[PDB]
Design a protein around this ligand. Structure first.
Ligand code: MAN
Ligand code: MAN
Ligand code: MAN
Ligand code: MAN
Ligand code: MAN
Ligand code: MAN
Ligand code: MAN
Lengths: 109, 109
């Protein structure tokens, strides 16, 4: 997987992968982007033993990490209002959240 | 491949594939979306005498099918100005263009 749409997220251990790039929600609750085994970016929210966290792209365009409970720990704070958004791990090493839908075929089944 | 970014395109014979869906820029210049083997969406540009067309997501948000000579055979008319856009073939069978980045890790290489 390389992207997340409204309501989708990464549970502890889950990740997006493209080439040697890896964006993962770890069992220490740290959200990290790796090039091979080298860490490149992180939410700096890790704590050994803090398992069960979840990262989720929401309807408001906000990407949030929650704990085993449902308490927030980190967020891009990119709330822009209800709509359709997507988070993508790009081939250029960048992780991006995109505006809202501007066009579609409308062929959802 | 399941997405196109600014200025990327599908050339004759190329496609985006999120089984069972297939968005293919056919040799006959017709851009078609198939569910398994059934066509469900089309640009309706299989004009006689046309060959070597390409479908490209433009920096202005517009998605347009061009003929060998660079003529506009079809467009989504989704022009929204200059920015960053991404067209994606979703697992729900829908083809969507998400308009302009609202957040990023800023980790491009
Ligand atoms: O910042 C993220 C980006 O940084 C670059 O220097 C490389 O390490 C890439 O592999 C990575 O995607
Ligand atoms: O309309 C869908 C259908 O159109 C026809 O003209 C051809 O281009 C076929 O390849 C395509 O499946
Ligand atoms: O800075 C990145 C680094 O932060 C912490 O040390 C842990 O979450 C590691 O798993 C991670 O690689
Ligand atoms: O700070 C995190 C917080 O930001 C906003 O208030 C909303 O998007 C909430 O859903 C989210 O929990
Ligand atoms: O019209 C855009 C919107 O259509 C449907 O609701 C779904 O396919 C969404 O994923 C998509 O963002
Ligand atoms: O009508 C299609 C036409 O729309 C706009 O003018 C631009 O996006 C052009 O590049 C494109 O060819
Ligand atoms: O800042 C967002 C922007 O960053 C860079 O320019 C590229 O990775 C683009 O694809 C992305 O949309």
């Amino acid at each position: 997987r390389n992207l997340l749409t409204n309501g989708e997220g990464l549970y502890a251990g889950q990740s997006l992968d493209v080439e040697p790039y890896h964006f993962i929600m770890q069992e220490d609750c740290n959200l990290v982007l790796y090039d091979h085994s080298t860490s490149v970016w992180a939410s700096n929210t890790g704590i050994l033993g803090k398992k069960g966290c979840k990262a989720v792209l929401q309807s408001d365009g906000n990407f949030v990490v929650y704990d085993a409970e449902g308490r927030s720990l980190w967020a891009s704070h990119s709330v822009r209002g209800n709509g359709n958004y997507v988070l993508v791990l790009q081939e250029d090493g960048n992780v991006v959240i995109y505006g809202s839908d501007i066009w579609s075929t409308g062929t959802y089944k």
